[PDB]
């Protein structure tokens with residue numbers, strides 16, 4: 001589909017048995033999800049934005065469905081107010097910017 | 100143009116006769132630029148981000164040419180980690196997400 005930017009580009013994502021709304025975010029290198037207790041190994045990381053940094057947990061090779069498109073990759077879990085689909089997964093679902 | 104997301108969508112902008120690099124940021128409501136001088140009246144504002152809240156200066160009806168496309172709108176100036184073009188100006192230049 002084509003998503004205009006009159007409103008926030010929120011879409012439905014699925015990560016295991018959880019459905020969540022998330023931003024398709026071209027300004028995000030990495031995918032950052034709200035606090036959730038995913039299985040498996042992880043490593044701590046800091047990521048920076050407006051207002052400074054948050055601590056996140058980096059999980060690798062996590063499958064996520066984004067509008068029925070399959071993705072799998074690194075997901076950072078931490079105290080974000082919004083779920084953020086970053087470029088690492090946007091490319092996998094064939095997402096481009098156009099003007 | 101069409102822009103893929105294997106790299107950061109950085110573009111050259113022209114503002115006040117100055118060329119800067121800025122990130123096309125679909126996850127940002129508002130355009131926020133690093134400290135710079137702009138003429139005219141501004142209003143103090145506070146905005147949120149992943150790391151907390153910051154103080155910015157709000158300038159209205161500022162011309163910016165983004166990758167050759169003309170916008171005239173609100174520019175927030177403050178301690179953003181990088182220059183970001185938000186949805187307020189992305190809509191003006193006709194930017195959409197497609198997959």
Ligand SMILES: CC(=O)c1cccc(N2C[C@@H](C(=O)N[C@@H](Cc3ccccc3)[C@H](O)CN(CC(C)C)S(=O)(=O)c3ccc4c(c3)OCO4)OC2=O)c1
Nearest residue numbers: 025027028029030047048049050082126127128147148149
């Ligand atoms: C309540 C609140 O916080 C709020 C309210 C209204 C608006 C906003 N913001 C904040 C601003 C913003 O910072 N956007 C982020 C995504 C985001 C959206 C809402 C809340 C928090 C974060 C950017 O699109 C992406 N950020 C990086 C840019 C600033 C350069 S980031 O900090 O979220 C980020 C994401 C992934 C990352 C990363 C940093 O480093 C590596 O991977 O855009 C908004 O619309 C926040």
